[PDB]
Amino acid sequence: AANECISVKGRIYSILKQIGSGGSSKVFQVLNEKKQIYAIKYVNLEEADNQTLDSYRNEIAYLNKLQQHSDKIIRLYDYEITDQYIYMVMECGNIDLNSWLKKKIDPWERKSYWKNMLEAVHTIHQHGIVHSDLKPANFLIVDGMLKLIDFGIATVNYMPPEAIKDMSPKSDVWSLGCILYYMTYGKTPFQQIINQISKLHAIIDPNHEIEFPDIPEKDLQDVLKCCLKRDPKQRISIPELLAHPYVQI
Numbered sequence: 001a002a003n004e005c006i007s008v009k010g011r012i013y014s015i016l017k018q019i020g021s022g023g024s025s026k027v028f029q030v031l032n033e034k035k036q037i038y039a040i041k042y043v044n045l046e047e048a049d050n051q052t053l054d055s056y057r058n059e060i061a062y063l064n065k066l067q068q069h070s071d072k073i074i075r076l077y078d079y080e081i082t083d084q085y086i087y088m089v090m091e092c093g094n095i096d097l098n099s100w101l102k103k104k105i106d107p108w109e110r111k112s113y114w115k116n117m118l119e120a121v122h123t124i125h126q127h128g129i130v131h132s133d134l135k136p137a138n139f140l141i142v143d144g145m146l147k148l149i150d151f152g153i154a155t156v157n158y159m160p161p162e163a164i165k166d167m168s169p170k171s172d173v174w175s176l177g178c179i180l181y182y183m184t185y186g187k188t189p190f191q192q193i194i195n196q197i198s199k200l201h202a203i204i205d206p207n208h209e210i211e212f213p214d215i216p217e218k219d220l221q222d223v224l225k226c227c228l229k230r231d232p233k234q235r236i237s238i239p240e241l242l243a244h245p246y247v248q249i
């Protein structure tokens, strides 16, 4: 309700509203000189250490490089890096997947979204990136399709057994499967448990079998069961999921 502006590389952008806030960052829905809509991410680097700085520099490098490879990764149009801040001019999505799911899916939409996620995670793996912390908040809805927001470079529900055991590209397969299990049944494989301490024990113990209620899409049931194999060696891969009947037939 005022004339608040952001300057990125000499280009003025008028703030519409704040669509994101977390840690030392803010995300704004903005208008450019030609009245077009974009999103701007602001990172405050004032209290960032050499390790945090490098992790932000690394994400920007991969984001600008990976962009040409896939249209399932958020479009970065411009950026400004100084010792004091980062400004990232991005495409504007309608909403993130986590928020969209909280107010909910169509079988054609679930498959269409799954294909987008597989394409995005496949693209980051081909460049030696294993996200390790994938969840619906990492995906953005833009013109009826999902686009990946971050690479993990910079809820215990989507956490794989390996990650708990360590306290691999297969870890992203577990997290992807957990998102598809949410879009299929309306809940996480372990969501039912309120006690977060007991929840971690169930992911490790193979004596605890994940529930798989029977649905019409027989192929979709097989994907979930393959994504949620506790042994990452026995667990399905990303090149395999792209060749799976659920994705193909």
Ligand SMILES: COc1cc(OC2CCN(C)CC2)ccc1Nc1nccc(-c2c[nH]c3cnccc23)n1
Pocket (backbone or CB within 6 Å): 019, 020, 027, 029, 039, 041, 090, 091, 092, 093, 094, 095, 096, 099, 140, 149
């Ligand atoms: C109207 O554009 C939106 C509304 C929106 O919904 C809001 C957030 C969720 N609450 C519940 C309701 C308000 C969520 C996303 C967008 N678009 C959008 N485009 C590009 C980037 C982002 C974004 C949000 N966080 C981030 C964190 N790192 C990078 C990028 C982002 N976001």
